[PDB]
Tab-separated table of C-alpha atoms and ligand atoms in Angstrom:
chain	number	residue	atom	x	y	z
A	1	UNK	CA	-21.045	8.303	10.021
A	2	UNK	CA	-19.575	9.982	13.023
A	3	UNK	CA	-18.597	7.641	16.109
A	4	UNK	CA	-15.531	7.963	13.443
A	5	UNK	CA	-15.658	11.926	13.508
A	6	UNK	CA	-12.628	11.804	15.084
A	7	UNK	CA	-11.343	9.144	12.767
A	8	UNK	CA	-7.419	10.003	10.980
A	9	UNK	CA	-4.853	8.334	9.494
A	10	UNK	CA	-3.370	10.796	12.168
A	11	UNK	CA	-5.064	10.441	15.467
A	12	UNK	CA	-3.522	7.536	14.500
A	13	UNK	CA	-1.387	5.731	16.996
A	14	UNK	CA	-0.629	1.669	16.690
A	15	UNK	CA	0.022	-0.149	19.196
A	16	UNK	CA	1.203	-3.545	18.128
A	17	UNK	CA	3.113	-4.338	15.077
A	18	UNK	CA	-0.076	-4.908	13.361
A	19	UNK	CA	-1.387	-1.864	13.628
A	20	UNK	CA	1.717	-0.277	12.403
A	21	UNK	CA	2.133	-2.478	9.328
A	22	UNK	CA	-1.551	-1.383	8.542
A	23	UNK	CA	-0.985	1.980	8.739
A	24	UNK	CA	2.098	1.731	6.578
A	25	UNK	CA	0.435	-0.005	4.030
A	26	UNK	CA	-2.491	2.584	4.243
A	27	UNK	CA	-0.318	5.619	3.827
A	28	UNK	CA	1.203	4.187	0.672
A	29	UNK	CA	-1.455	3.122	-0.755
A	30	UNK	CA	-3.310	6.585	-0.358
A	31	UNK	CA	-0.202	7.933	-2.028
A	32	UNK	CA	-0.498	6.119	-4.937
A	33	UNK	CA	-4.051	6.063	-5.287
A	34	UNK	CA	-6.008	6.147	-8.430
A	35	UNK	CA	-9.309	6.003	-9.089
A	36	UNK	CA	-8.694	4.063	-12.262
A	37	UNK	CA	-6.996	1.074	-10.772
A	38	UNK	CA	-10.263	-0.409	-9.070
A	39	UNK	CA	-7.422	-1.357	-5.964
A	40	UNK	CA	-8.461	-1.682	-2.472
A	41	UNK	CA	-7.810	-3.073	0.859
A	42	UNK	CA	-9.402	-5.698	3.410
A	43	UNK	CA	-9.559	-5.230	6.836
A	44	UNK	CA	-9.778	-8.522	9.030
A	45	UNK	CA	-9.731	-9.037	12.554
A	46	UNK	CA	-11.500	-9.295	15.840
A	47	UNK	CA	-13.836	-6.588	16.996
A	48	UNK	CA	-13.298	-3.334	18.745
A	49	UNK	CA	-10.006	-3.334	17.189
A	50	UNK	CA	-10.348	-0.379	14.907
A	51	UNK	CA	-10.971	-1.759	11.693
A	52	UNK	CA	-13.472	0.548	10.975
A	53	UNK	CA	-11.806	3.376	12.200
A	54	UNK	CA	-8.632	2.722	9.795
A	55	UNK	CA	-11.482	2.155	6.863
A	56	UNK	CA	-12.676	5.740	7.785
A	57	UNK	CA	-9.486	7.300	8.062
A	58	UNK	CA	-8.269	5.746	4.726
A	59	UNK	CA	-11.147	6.766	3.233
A	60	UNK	CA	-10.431	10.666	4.211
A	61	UNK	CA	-7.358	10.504	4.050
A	62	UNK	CA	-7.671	9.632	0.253
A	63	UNK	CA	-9.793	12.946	-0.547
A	64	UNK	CA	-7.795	15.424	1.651
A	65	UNK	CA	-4.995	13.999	-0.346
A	66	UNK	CA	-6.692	13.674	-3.810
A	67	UNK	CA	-9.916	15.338	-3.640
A	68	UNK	CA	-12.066	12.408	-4.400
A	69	UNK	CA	-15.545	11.530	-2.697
A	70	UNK	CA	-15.842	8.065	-1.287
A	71	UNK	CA	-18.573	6.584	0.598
A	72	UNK	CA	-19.300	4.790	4.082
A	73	UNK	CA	-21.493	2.359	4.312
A	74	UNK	CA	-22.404	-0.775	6.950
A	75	UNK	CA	-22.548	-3.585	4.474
A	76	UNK	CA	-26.387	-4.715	6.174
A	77	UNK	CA	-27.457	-1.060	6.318
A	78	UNK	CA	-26.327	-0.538	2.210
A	79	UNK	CA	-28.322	-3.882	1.598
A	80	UNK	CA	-30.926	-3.119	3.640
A	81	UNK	CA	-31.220	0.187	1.990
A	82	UNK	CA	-31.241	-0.956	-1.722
A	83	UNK	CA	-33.516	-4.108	-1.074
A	84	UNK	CA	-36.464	-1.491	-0.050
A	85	UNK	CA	-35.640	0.818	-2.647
A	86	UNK	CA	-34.987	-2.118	-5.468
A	87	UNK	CA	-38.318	-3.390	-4.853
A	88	UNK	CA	-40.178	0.153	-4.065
A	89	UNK	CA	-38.937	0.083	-7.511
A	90	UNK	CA	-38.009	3.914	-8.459
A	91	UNK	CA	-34.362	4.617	-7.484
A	92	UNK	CA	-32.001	3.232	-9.528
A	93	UNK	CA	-30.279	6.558	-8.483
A	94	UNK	CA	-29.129	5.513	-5.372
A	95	UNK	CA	-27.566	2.078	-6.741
A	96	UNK	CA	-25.973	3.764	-9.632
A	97	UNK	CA	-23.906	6.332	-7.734
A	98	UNK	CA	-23.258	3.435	-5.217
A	99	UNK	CA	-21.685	1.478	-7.730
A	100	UNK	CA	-20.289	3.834	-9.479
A	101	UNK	CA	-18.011	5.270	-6.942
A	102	UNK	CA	-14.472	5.878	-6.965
A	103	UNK	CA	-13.755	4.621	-3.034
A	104	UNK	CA	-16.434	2.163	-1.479
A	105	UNK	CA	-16.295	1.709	2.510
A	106	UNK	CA	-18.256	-1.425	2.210
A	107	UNK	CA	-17.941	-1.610	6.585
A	108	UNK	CA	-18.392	-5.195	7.695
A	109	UNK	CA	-19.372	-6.944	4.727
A	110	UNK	CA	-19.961	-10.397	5.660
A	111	UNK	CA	-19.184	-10.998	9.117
A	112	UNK	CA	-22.380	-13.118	10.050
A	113	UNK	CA	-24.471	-15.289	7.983
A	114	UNK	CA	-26.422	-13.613	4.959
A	115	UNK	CA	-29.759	-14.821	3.885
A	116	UNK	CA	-29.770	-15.935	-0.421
A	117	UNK	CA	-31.442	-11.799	-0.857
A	118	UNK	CA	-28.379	-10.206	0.979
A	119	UNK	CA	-25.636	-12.655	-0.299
A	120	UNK	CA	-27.187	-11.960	-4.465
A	121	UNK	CA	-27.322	-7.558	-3.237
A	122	UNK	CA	-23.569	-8.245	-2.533
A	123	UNK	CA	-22.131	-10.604	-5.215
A	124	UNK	CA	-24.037	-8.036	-7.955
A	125	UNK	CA	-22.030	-5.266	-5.941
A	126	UNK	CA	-18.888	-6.646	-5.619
A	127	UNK	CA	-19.095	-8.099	-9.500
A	128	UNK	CA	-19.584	-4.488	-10.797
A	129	UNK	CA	-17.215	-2.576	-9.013
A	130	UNK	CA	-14.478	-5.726	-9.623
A	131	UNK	CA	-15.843	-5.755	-13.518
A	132	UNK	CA	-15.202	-1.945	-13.462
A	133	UNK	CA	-12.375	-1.534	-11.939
A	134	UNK	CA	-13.614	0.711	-8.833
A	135	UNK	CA	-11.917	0.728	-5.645
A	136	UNK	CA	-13.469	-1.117	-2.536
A	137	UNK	CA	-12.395	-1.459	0.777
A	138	UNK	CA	-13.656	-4.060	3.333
A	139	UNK	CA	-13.839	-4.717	6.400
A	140	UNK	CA	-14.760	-7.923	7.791
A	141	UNK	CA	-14.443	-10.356	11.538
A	142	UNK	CA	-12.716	-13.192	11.877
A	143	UNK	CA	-12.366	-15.112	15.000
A	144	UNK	CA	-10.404	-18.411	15.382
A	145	UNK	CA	-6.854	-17.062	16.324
A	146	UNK	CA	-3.555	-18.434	15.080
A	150	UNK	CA	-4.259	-17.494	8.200
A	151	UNK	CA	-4.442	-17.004	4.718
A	152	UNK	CA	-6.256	-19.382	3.442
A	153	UNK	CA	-8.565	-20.226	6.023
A	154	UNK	CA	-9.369	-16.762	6.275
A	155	UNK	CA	-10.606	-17.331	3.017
A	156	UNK	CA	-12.426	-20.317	3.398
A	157	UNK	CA	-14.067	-18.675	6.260
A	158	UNK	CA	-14.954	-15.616	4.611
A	159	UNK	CA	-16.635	-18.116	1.235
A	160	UNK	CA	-18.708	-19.572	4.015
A	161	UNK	CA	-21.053	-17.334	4.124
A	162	UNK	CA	-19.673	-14.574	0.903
A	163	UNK	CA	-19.515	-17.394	-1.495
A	164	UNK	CA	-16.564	-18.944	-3.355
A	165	UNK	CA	-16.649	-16.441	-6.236
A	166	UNK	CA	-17.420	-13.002	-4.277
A	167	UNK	CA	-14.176	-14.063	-1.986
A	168	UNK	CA	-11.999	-14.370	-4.856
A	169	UNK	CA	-12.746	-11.500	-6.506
A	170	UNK	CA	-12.309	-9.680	-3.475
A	171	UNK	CA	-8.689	-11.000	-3.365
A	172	UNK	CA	-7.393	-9.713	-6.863
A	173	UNK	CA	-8.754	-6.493	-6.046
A	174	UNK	CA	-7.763	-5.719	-1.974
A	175	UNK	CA	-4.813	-6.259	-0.088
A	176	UNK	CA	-4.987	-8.212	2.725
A	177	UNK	CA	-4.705	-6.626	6.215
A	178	UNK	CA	-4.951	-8.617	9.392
A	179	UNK	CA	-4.941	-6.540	12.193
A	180	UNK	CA	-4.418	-7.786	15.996
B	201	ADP	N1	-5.349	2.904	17.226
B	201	ADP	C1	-6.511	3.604	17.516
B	201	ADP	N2	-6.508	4.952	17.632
B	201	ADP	C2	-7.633	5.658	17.907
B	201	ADP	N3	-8.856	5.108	18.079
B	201	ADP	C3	-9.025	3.778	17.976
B	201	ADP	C4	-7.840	2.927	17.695
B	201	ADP	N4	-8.287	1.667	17.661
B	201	ADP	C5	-9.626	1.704	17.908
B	201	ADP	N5	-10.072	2.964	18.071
B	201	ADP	C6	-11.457	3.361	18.415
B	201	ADP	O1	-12.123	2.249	19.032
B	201	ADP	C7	-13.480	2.148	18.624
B	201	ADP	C8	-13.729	0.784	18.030
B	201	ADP	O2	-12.971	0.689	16.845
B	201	ADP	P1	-13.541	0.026	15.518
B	201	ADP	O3	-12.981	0.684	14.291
B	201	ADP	O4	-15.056	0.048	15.478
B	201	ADP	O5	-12.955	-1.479	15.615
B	201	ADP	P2	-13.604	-2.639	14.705
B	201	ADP	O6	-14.193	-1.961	13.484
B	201	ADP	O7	-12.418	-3.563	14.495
B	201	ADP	O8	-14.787	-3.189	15.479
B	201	ADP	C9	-13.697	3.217	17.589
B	201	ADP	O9	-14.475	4.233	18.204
B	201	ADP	C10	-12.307	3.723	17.223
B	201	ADP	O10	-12.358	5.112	17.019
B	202	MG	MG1	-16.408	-2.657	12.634
C-alpha cells in the first residue's frame, strides 16, 4: 500500500513526453469515469519508471473525484492470496468483493512467467470483470525497446491469447518511457 503514500496525480511531474501524454490521458479519463463502463487503462514499460505510482494515483484520484472505492493489489500477492483461501475453502468473500469492484489496481499482472494455477486465477479474473463490465487497470513490464503488436504478443506469452485480448477492448494502452 504505502511506498505510494505519497502517490498523486499531483505530485505529479513528467518528465518526458511520455509521461505527460500519460498523465493527460489519466486526467481525462478520471473525468469521465463511470463505474458502469467496465473501461480501464494499461500501463507498460520498463521498471522503476512509475507505473505503479500513476496506477495509484489514478486510482485516488478517481475517488477524491467521484467517491468510489477501488482496490490495490500486486497481481502475485492477489493470486497468492485467493489460491490459499480458494482451497482453505471458506471465503468466497474475499473473491466476490474482488471481483466485484468498481476500480481494480491489478499491479504487475503478468510480467514474468505464471505457472497453469496462476495463469487459470487470472483468466477467471480478468473474464469476470471484462464479462461485467468492471473497470481494471494494469500494469505490466516490457523490455525489448523500439510496439503495438508485439507488445501484445509478448504480453500472450505468458497471459494467454484470450486474457490479452480482452484486456485490449477494455484498457487503453499506455506506454510509458
Ligand atoms: N514522475 C514521478 N513523480 C514522482 N515519483 C515518481 C515518478 N516516477 C517514479 N516515481 C517514484 O519512483 C518509484 C518507482 O516507481 P514505480 O511506480 O514503482 O515504477 P514502476 O511501477 O514502473 O516500477 C516509486 O516510489 C514512485 O513513487
Ligand atoms: Mg511496478
Amino acid at each position: 500500500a504505502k511506498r505510494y503514500w505519497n502517490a498523486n496525480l499531483d505530485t505529479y511531474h513528467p518528465k518526458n513526453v511520455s509521461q505527460n501524454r500519460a498523465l493527460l490521458t489519466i486526467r481525462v479519463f478520471v473525468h469521465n469515469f463511470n463505474p458502469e463502463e467496465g473501461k480501464g487503462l494499461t500501463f507498460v514499460g520498463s521498471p522503476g519508471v512509475g507505473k505503479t505510482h500513476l496506477a495509484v494515483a489514478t486510482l485516488k484520484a478517481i475517488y477524491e473525484k467521484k467517491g468510489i472505492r477501488g482496490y490495490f493489489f500486486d497481481t502475485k500477492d492477489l493470486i497468492f492470496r485467493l489460491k490459499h483461501l480458494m482451497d482453505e475453502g471458506k471465503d468466497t468473500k474475499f473473491l466476490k468483493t474482488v471481483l466485484n469492484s468498481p476500480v481494480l489496481v491489478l499491479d504487475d499482472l503478468g510480467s514474468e512467467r505464471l505457472s497453469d494455477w496462476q495463469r487459470e486465477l487470472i483468466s477467471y479474473i480478468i473474464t469476470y470483470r471484462y464479462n461485467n463490465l468492471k473497470s481494471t487497470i494494469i500494469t505490466t513490464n516490457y523490455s525489448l525497446q523500439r510496439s503495438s503488436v508485439r507488445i501484445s504478443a509478448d504480453l500472450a506469452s505468458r497471459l494467454g491469447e484470450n486474457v490479452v485480448s480482452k484486456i485490449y477492448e477494455m484498457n487503453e494502452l499506455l506506454v510509458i518511457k
